[PDB]
């Protein structure tokens, strides 16, 4: 089955990197909107 | 071996026809013929 087992693992790795790419944009939104005082 | 087979086809193919000029024994005429005819068809495989 390795002639497709690695290919299903590719699509799982592709959705995993798409989820992380969506999550990096929220971490940036936190630093953008966060209240910063006493650290400046 | 392509060079060697061509070397044999020319040098021996002379002696199988030389009777046209220098008198050569029948025995040698057909000893050279047996070799030349063989190598003409083996070396055709390289074409």
């Amino acid at each position: 089955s390795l002639e497709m087992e690695i290919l299903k693992q590719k699509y799982r790795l592709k959705d995993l990197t798409f989820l992380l790419e969506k999550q990096h944009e929220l971490i940036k939104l936190i630093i953008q909107k966060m209240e910063i005082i006493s650290e400046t | 071996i392509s060079n060697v087979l061509e070397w044999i086809i020319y040098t021996t193919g002379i002696i199988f026809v030389l009777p046209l000029f220098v008198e050569i024994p029948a025995h040698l005429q057909w000893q050279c013929g047996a070799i030349a005819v063989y190598f003409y068809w083996m070396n055709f495989l390289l074409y």
Partner: protein, 270 residues
């Protein structure tokens, strides 16, 4: 220091306050420890509302210690919203060279940002070699950036991209030979433009198909396909017809002339 942090992290309300109390342009244009300036920090992190605000406040497209422009950082990161903002102010910025001769388009292609390559390429970026004698197309290929090279082949500018290469280089040859050496599935896509069906139904007596060979010529392409073991490109219909055409051109007549000169002794001796 403060404005640099504010612009690096998209803190647009902090920026509107930092550039309200202080009207000095020496802060807005302030060189950083790395030679950077707030407009680079904003562009580098992909903030499109900050890079716009600093340009509206009157920032200058200055250069980093590494020689990079704001548009170079925006391209390196693939941040189309920021590039579109930058290009809308000063399209004359686009051709700038860093202290190593890369342009914005080199960084976009080297990193694999097709939308970013597509935006610069369609907004009239100047295709050029960097100081290592390599173009953006050459950079994309040596980093196996399939989407970027596929976006370039689909471009309105492809023939201008293909014409620009260093003939004196062993490392940056004709891009077609480099595509074969790295990205053969893009060469397959490129060869599909060489075929065009005209009647859409193969049973019809007037049905025909045409093969164009302009990419296989200057047998350099098929020699490169053999040396790189590209059996699926060798067996592509454009390549089968190119070989059969080369055989009907002279290869058949040259073989039968040599074989016939041998047959002249072979048959008479039998």
């Amino acid at each position: 220091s403060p404005l640099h942090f504010a612009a690096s992290y998209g803190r647009i309300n902090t920026c509107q306050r930092l550039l309200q109390d202080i009207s000095d342009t020496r802060l807005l244009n302030e060189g950083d420890l790395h030679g950077m300036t707030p407009l680079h920090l904003a562009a580098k992190n992909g903030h499109d509302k900050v890079v716009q605000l600093l340009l509206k406040k009157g920032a200058l497209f200055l250069s980093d210690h590494n020689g990079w422009t704001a548009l170079h950082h925006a391209s390196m990161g693939g941040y189309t919203q920021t590039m579109k903002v930058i290009l809308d102010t000063n399209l004359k910025c686009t051709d700038r060279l860093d202290e190593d001769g890369n342009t914005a388009l080199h960084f976009a292609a080297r990193e694999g940002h097709a939308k970013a390559v597509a935006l610069l390429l369609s907004h009239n970026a100047d295709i050029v070699l960097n100081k290592q004698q390599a173009s953006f197309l050459h950079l994309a290929l040596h980093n196996k950036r399939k989407e970027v090279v596929l976006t370039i082949i689909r471009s309105k500018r492809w023939d201008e991209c293909l014409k620009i290469f260093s003939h004196n280089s062993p490392g940056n040859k004709c891009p077609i030979t480099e595509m074969i050496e790295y990205l053969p599935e893009c060469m397959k896509v490129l060869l599909d433009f060489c075929m065009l069906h005209s009647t859409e139904d193969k049973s019809c007596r007037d049905y025909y198909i045409e093969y164009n060979f302009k990419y296989l010529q200057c047998l350099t392409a098929l020699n490169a396909m053999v040396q790189n073991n590209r059996i699926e490109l060798l067996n592509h219909p454009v390549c089968k017809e190119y070989l059969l055409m080369k055989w009907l051109a002279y290869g058949f007549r040259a073989h039968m002339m040599n074989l016939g000169s041998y047959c002249l002794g072979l048959i008479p001796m039998t």
